[PDB]
Design a protein around this ligand. Structure first.
Ligand SMILES: CS(=O)(=O)c1ccc(C(O)=C2C(=O)CCCC2=O)c([N+](=O)[O-])c1
Ligand SMILES: O=C(O)CCC(=O)C(=O)O
Ligand SMILES: [Co+2]
Length: 344
């Protein structure tokens, strides 16, 4: 039974204690037993005006942010507040539907076996696995010919249209960030555009974190780094919870309305020879309100061999990561963090 979890939104309704499968060992808890989860992020806060990324001072801000945090907030990103609010409303609308309606999109293929795409939870591997306090709807967006539209919610009926339009807007953001990164690494503005390739990948993950009566005991999403090249994250109504690790310390990622958060993923850490790192991040829950986010994961095409860019290497700049085909990295990332296995 334990390999077929009931959605946390159901298990959380009205409870005053988290069920045992969500409770972390005391030393793993946010605050490690206590109620102080994270430190405020010190100034300067990493914020990048995406419309001015060709100005030298703005490019410098992007570089500083990537060296320091591996992530940054973006303003002037070209996405209407109306579209951001509507795509997150469509997500909320879906999660508020009855369990049996959402389960038509279940990622448990016969109610028993996990796959990534669909509505439900991440894979449960071992009965001792501590589960995260969240549900998610995860969908293949690109390459468009690999989509399985049977997993895309039909209600509200504008869900697909809104996701398609939003993702076309975050793809613009992806391209601007990647071009700025090729330039600052002196690899050519185009370098990462060519890396992701014609069949560049895009996955949409709608996260739903129910309120938790004991946020000191659980993770909304456990510490992790993302697997792709860059992630573009939208947090609905800027509800707090997202935290980033730097030097063993957990820092609150600040909220800014109508902004996006851009963070690097493991594929970029490999490609850029670890000059910038893929940041480890987590979500802590709260007692008062649900929290919703939409992560757009952008990665390289499946056949691309991930390796440190030749332009970053030389006699005194050895490769720090071993070569691996992108699809094999993602599979290995699924089944000690996985990117450490690639270090040489
Ligand atoms: C959830 S994740 O481990 O960050 C994550 C998982 C899979 C993918 C994605 O499907 C890609 C391709 O399909 C296969 C090659 C690698 C590439 O990454 C992404 N992505 O496109 O960014 C992220
Ligand atoms: O909900 C968030 O703010 C973070 C989501 C996240 O880390 C992920 O979906 O990989
Ligand atoms: Co993440």
């Amino acid at each position: 039974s334990w390999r077929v979890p009931t959605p946390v939104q159901e298990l959380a309704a009205g409870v005053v204690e988290p069920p045992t499968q969500f409770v972390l060992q005391e030393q793993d808890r946010p605050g490690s037993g206590t109620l102080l989860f994270a430190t405020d992020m010190p100034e300067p806060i990493p914020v990048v005006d995406l419309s001015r990324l060709a100005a030298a001072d703005e490019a410098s801000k992007l570089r500083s942010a990537l060296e320091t945090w591996g992530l940054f907030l973006v303003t002037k990103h070209g996405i209407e507040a109306s579209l951001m609010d509507d795509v997150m409303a469509a997500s909320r609308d879906f999660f508020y539907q009855p369990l049996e309606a959402k389960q038509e999109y279940s990622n448990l293929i016969g109610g028993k076996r996990f796959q990534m795409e669909g509505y439900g939870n991440d894979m449960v591997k071992s009965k001792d696995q501590i589960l995260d306090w969240q549900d998610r709807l995860q969908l293949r967006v690109e390459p468009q010919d690999e989509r399985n539209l049977a997993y895309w919610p039909k209600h509200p009926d504008s869900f697909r249209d809104l996701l398609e339009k939003y993702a076309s807007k975050t793809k613009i953001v992806r391209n601007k960030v990647l071009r700025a990164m090729g330039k600052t690494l002196e690899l050519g503005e185009d370098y990462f555009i060519s890396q992701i390739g014609d069949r560049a990948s895009a996955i949409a993950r709608f996260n739903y974190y129910p309120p938790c009566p004991r946020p000191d005991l659980v993770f909304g999403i456990k510490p992790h780094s993302d697997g792709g090249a860059v992630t573009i994250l939208l947090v609905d109504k800027d509800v707090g919870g997202l935290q980033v690790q730097k030097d063993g310390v957990w820092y609150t990622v600040p909220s800014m309305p109508h902004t996006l958060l851009v963070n690097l993923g493991d594929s970029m850490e490999i490609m850029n020879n670890g000059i910038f790192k893929s940041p480890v991040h987590r979500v802590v829950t709260n007692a008062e309100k649900e929290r919703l986010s939409l992560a757009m994961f952008y990665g390289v095409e499946g056949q691309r061999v991930l390796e440190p860019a030749l332009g970053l290497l030389g006699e005194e700049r050895p490769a720090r990561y071993r070569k691996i085909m992108a699809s094999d990295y993602i599979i290995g990332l699924r089944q000690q963090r996985f990117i450490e296995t690639l270090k040489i």
